[PDB]
Amino acid sequence: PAAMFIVNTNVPRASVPDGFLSELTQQLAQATGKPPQYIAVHVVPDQLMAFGGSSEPCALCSLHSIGKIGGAQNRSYSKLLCGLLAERLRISPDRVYINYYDMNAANVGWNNSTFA
Amino acid sequence: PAAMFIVNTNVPRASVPDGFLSELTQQLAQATGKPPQYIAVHVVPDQLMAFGGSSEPCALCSLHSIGKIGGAQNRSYSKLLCGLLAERLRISPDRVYINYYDMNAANVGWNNSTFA
Amino acid sequence: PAAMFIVNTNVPRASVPDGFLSELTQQLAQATGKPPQYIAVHVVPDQLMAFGGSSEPCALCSLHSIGKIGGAQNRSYSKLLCGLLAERLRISPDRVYINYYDMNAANVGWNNSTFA
Ligand SMILES: CC(C)C(=O)c1c(C(C)C)nn2ccccc12
Ligand SMILES: [Cl-]
Ligand SMILES: [Cl-]
Ligand SMILES: [Cl-]
Ligand SMILES: [Cl-]
Numbered sequence: 325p326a327a328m329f330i331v332n333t334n335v336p337r338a339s340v341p342d343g344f345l346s347e348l349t350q351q352l353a354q355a356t357g358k359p360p361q362y363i364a365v366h367v368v369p370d371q372l373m374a375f376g377g378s379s380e381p382c383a384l385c386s387l388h389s390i391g392k393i394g395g396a397q398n399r400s401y402s403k404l405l406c407g408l409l410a411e412r413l414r415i416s417p418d419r420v421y422i423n424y425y426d427m428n429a430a431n432v433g434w435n436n437s438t439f440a
Numbered sequence: 441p442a443a444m445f446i447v448n449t450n451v452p453r454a455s456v457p458d459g460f461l462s463e464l465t466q467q468l469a470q471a472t473g474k475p476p477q478y479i480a481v482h483v484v485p486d487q488l489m490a491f492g493g494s495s496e497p498c499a500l501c502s503l504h505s506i507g508k509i510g511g512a513q514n515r516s517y518s519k520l521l522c523g524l525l526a527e528r529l530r531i532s533p534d535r536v537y538i539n540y541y542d543m544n545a546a547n548v549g550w551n552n553s554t555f556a
Numbered sequence: 557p558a559a560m561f562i563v564n565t566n567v568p569r570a571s572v573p574d575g576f577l578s579e580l581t582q583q584l585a586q587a588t589g590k591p592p593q594y595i596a597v598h599v600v601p602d603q604l605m606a607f608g609g610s611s612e613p614c615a616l617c618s619l620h621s622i623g624k625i626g627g628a629q630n631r632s633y634s635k636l637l638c639g640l641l642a643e644r645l646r647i648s649p650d651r652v653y654i655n656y657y658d659m660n661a662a663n664v665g666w667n668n669s670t671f672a
């Protein structure tokens with residue numbers, strides 16, 4: 325099992341609250357049902373980005389996961405993650421995209437091998 | 441509908457025009473047939489990169505879109521995007537890769553939900 | 557053909573050895589059997605990341621390739637790449653993920669066209 329979440333945003337680094345990586349780890353572990361040991365997170369502030377031609381605060385994110393991806397699940401993840409970006413980074417949820425990827429275990433490397 | 445274009449390059453931030461993200465937004469809106477509101481753009485300069493073993497200017501890019509991806513369309517997008525990168529960032533078109541992704545609406549989160 | 561490898565890490569830039577990009581290019585050319593001219597590499601240090609809730613050294617990587625991706629092949633790449641990250645960046649192999657992508661030629665743009 326593995327899942328990784330990346331958020332790219334134009335919000336300044338100083339605006340990312342202390343503990344944000346830990347919150348994302350914890351809340352994604354809950355949402356996906358995976359042990360937090362297997363969750364990786366990456367937050368990239370201060371980016372040169374635009375959404376709909378506006379450079380107001382926005383985010384482009386991805387969640388790659390071995391399983392636990394699907395229509396209803398992804399709706400739930402989007403409510404969780406957009407809520408966090410709004411409440412913690414002050415980004416409007418209508419200025420967030422999250423791309424979701426269901427990875428085959430054979431296509432995820434870890435510890436000198438793969439999960440297959 | 442949604443599309444997102446990301447360009448990672450070793451060219452310096454000062455060499456990225458201030459209007460580039462808007463230029464990309466408008467040209468991609470035209471190319472995909474989508475209103476510009478649905479187009480997001482992310483440019484990442486000053487990267488540590490090599491292309492073919494050389495660190496002359498280069499770009500690694502991706503275009504993710506809900507639909508409007510396919511053999512012929514992608515041939516056309518490559519001309520558009522190579523043209524823009526050549527003119528505005530001074531990158532030779534033979535030092536550009538663009539990975540194309542046709543996303544299912546169910547796998548694109550936006551505004552606390554997905555597009556499905 | 558085409559292949560591209562990206563490594564995102566929290567390790568500082570100063571700890572990435574001189575010659576690291578060239579080592580990645582050459583080792584990936586050997587591993588994939590593709591000429592180095594077709595291989596692009598991208599290293600992104602100093603990132604805000606966590607792996608398993610910890611911000612000890614870690615890496616999130618991806619290898620996109622037209623072909624040369626599969627169960628056994630990916631195991632082999634993971635041993636190679638984790639080995640390099642361990643010896644050169646001092647990152648433990650159990651704090652590395654590598655996502656592997658077999659791209660269709662029609663979905664890889666280069667030089668005003670695609671590979672199809
Ligand atoms: C024949 C073309 C499509 C090709 O494979 C490439 C060529 C030619 C010169 C064989 N150079 N090159 C550099 C980076 C990526 C791809 C290529
Ligand atoms: Cl589901
Ligand atoms: Cl996969
Ligand atoms: Cl098409
Ligand atoms: Cl998809």
Ligand SMILES: [Cl-]
Pocket residue numbers: 625626627628629630
């Ligand atoms: Cl294989």
Ligand SMILES: [Cl-]
Pocket residue numbers: 658659660663
């Ligand atoms: Cl593909």
